Symmetry: C2
Subunit: 382 residues, 2 copies
Amino acid sequence: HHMRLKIAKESLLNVLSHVVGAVERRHTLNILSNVKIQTNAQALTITGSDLEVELVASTALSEGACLEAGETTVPARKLMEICKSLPTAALIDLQITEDQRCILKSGNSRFVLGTLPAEDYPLLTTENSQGTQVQVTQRELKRLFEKTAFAMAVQDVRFYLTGTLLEIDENQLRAVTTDGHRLALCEILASSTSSQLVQAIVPRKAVGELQRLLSIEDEQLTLLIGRELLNVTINTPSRDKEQGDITVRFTTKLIDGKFPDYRRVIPRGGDKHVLIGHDVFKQSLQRVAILSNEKLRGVFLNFNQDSLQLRANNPEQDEAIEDLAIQYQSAPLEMSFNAQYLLDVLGVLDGDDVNMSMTEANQSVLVQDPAHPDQTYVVMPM
Amino acid sequence: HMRLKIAKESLLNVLSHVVGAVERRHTLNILSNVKIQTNAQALTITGSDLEVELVASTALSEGACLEAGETTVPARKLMEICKSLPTAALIDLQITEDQRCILKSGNSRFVLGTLPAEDYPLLTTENSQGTQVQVTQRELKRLFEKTAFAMAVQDVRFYLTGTLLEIDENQLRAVTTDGHRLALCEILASSTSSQLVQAIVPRKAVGELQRLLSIEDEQLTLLIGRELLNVTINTPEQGDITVRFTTKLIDGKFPDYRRVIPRGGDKHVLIGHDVFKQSLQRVAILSNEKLRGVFLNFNQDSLQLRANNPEQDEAIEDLAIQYQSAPLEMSFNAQYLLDVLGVLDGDDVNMSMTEANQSVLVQDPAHPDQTYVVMPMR
């Protein structure tokens, strides 16, 4: 019949917090701006999606929480705001009427929102089958994205550039990202059945959502990677007085393309190798950059034996020059890089030293951390 | 030429005070630079946009000043360059004949383009003068916090975009208005001259002044003239820095604010501050996004807040208040009432009104020095 539910502010908001990151402020399909809420005596399920990424969060309800079972759709952003505005430990009474109106009462406050029918809410149907399953911990998966999120393109004509390639091969999961000017790669240990490689290009919004959901803990996760979709169920531990655990089901349409062979892009020529202290390199580039071109941000790195010179100048003829101590005994080379790209990779590296492998000025550069061989970064020249 | 050897922090502290006045782009290009003067005893840096002028001075250690001179250096760049250096670094400034400023710290060398110190324009002049006012930094700063929000952001009536400093016999007063609301605050301040004087201080001037002033009880002498307002502030550990602040006043006639405030309110309501702020915020969620309009209905012993939007969503909240006067219904911009609440530090809030189509006086019993007026909608 018609849904009615009485629950604590924190309980409702907590489940909602996990799903409303997927909801778009305005969407071509009007109903997707709303969250779908379904309740019965034992559990409350909330769904949020934009048809590319879908999140379903559910929790075990309290004894008297569901007065009347039912399902409906409520404007997600408003409801979330309404809940946060209530005082701590408040109790909300939700009522859905025959005319499509959702009535929220808490304390002396009375709110009324417009609802839309729950069966009009679109779900990501799984028309394919026989997907690949990968076993990986949350930390390992979260790490893959943290070390490669930056090089992804924000918006572009070519779609696969905007996503993260997730590849499974020989008991190791890999994440690869590129915008055409740089590349990031991270590899971790995962368990899977397939002997052959499987590839999934995960859209940028989905990657962000997953990053928020994952934790540092080593809880095992099972990823189902199909030709058209990627599925993962995560159990978030909700620790509150008498609060049930929240289970979130993540579904995302994979980007339809074929990612470029990343291995061919990675330089293994390695003629010249340099090792530099991470702090010195980071600090020096920031200094030199101040006088580089404002949008372009290009600086010149001149490599000489055991000494790196950073040089930058702008249109106003201002110049910055600094000398750094580096572990380099090979031939001389001067290159120019978009500073920010170097600074971006440095943010990703947790080790004390930084190593670069170079061949020629025109050619690309390979950057890494000796301590962590799992991460590999490439930066092209100007 | 000018040469100077100064610690990173010493140079940085001086620049930080003055950089707020500098503009990213200015019609006169030189004002994007900061003017630097040095001699054996002191360092003086000036930042200005020709509406507000800041001059920061410090006592230089002997021998820091290798050569005395003056010049102008791009302020934003200099500021960033100094921040990028390591802690406790030593900077060597050098000005060459070809207008290049060479700055060397550690292993890094920086070169900026300079412009003639001669060209740099100054607001002040020898015959500037001014009627003195004695006021504490804490009190002056307080005056600005209380009335700053109600100034108009942009308006043809240029006077509206500034705070009016008015001096009464025993106190200094700050008044701001944008047409839809008004803020007023009074603080005791000594007056040597005992003549009413009005100064309309520009919005940027007020912001700069708020940043520089501190919450301590240090007396200040404020010079107020027909065209400028001047005050020397010694800032409250990096030695000691004195800043000379000068501003071009808005040459206009501020409206008679006393007419605008209404003392005739018959209908009076007292509401808990926290309750009112929370309630208003809750109901405002479901109000028009651009307009932010909420309805306040006054009934015996209760306050009803109601808001709706185009999607016909509705929020209603009831507040228990002691009101036994005739029922009144009014429409207000939620932001205007919330803004007033932000500057009220007291536990209760007093509202006095006459009719639905007329203004409302808002006050905090604990602090009678502050008075606010909000004009209703429709």
